[PDB]
Design a protein around this ligand. Structure first.
Ligand SMILES: N[C@@H](Cc1cc(I)c(Oc2ccc(O)c(I)c2)c(I)c1)C(=O)O
Ligand SMILES: N[C@@H](Cc1cc(I)c(Oc2ccc(O)c(I)c2)c(I)c1)C(=O)O
Length: 263
């Protein structure tokens, strides 16, 4: 119609449908309500003491040793972080309608990818830090030494690169939904349904990116490459986590940390 054309005049690319907007809204709010500190993180966060995370002392196969005190500081806050990822997922109808067993497999599969993304989007260029759970600002050396090794470097590089993308809450939430609804896991019951849901999220996300009209070119494929980086981060972490368990006693690992990162 005449009105439709007028308002779509500076549009070419497909916008989200009404159905996709509903999808977008629900996921955005699911993320906002489960993202620690929300909009206030920069003010409310405290730096991890400079004297912590400078003392790698426990051996690892790749030679990047672990600072036990720093590892402990990190693991002490990881349970509420994992919990919020579970909280986010439960708020998406296409996730909550899956069998309980599939939900668990999907959460285990994407948990590090999502937490890494949530750290990365809170990279602060001025202090050169990530913020963990909206409350703990950490330097590259600290996060490296406290257990992550080269995974820290990868997350910092992702965070630095994401600054220019200027992602909003919706884009972060849709990335999380896409990571969550991956069928690259063993033992799933409802593979076709999960794939259909990821396809629905991907198309809604592509259309939202169109709606946003970012100033950087090739935004959509660029964002997809970032998903691939997040996958590599998740994989490197899973491998390193196996080594952590070989080296250190169970008592240093919070129960949920152990459960979610099971091989
Ligand atoms: N910042 C995120 C939560 C988040 C919390 C923590 I502790 C993180 O560090 C990790 C992760 C895995 C590990 O094995 C180790 I050792 C340290 C990261 I990366 C992210 C959020 O806002 O939800
Ligand atoms: N179900 C799929 C959906 C999906 C499919 C494709 I093709 C993607 O682009 C890729 C993938 C791997 C690469 O090496 C490169 I370069 C680009 C992405 I990002 C996601 C998934 O969850 O990955």
């Amino acid at each position: 119609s005449h009105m439709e054309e007028m308002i779509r005049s500076l549009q070419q690319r497909p916008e989200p449908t009404p159905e996709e907007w509903d999808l977008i809204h629900i996921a955005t709010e699911a993320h906002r309500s489960t993202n620690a500190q929300g909009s206030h993180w920069k003010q409310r966060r405290k730096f991890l003491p400079d004297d912590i995370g400078q003392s790698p002392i426990v051996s690892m196969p790749d030679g990047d040793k672990v600072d036990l005190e720093a590892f402990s500081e990190f693991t002490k806050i990881i349970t509420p972080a994992i919990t919020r990822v579970v909280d986010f997922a439960k708020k998406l109808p296409m996730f909550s309608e899956l069998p309980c067993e599939d939900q668990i497999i999907l959460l285990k599969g994407c948990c590090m990818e999502i937490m890494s993304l949530r750290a990365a989007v809170r990279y602060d260029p001025e202090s050169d830090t990530l913020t963990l759970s909206g409350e703990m600002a950490v330097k590259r050396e600290q996060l490296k030494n406290g257990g992550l090794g080269v995974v820290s470097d990868a997350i910092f590089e992702l965070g630095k690169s994401l600054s220019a993308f200027n992602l909003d809450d919706t884009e972060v939430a849709l990335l999380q939904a896409v990571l969550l609804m991956s069928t690259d896991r063993s033992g799933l019951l409802c593979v076709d349904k999960i794939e259909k849901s990821q396809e629905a999220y991907l198309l809604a996300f592509e259309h939202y990116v169109n709606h946003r009209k970012h100033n950087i070119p090739h935004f959509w494929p660029k964002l997809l490459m970032k998903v691939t980086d997040l996958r590599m981060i998740g994989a490197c972490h899973a491998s390193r986590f196996l080594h952590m368990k070989v080296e250190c006693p169970t008592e240093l690992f919070p129960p949920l940390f152990l459960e979610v990162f099971e091989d």
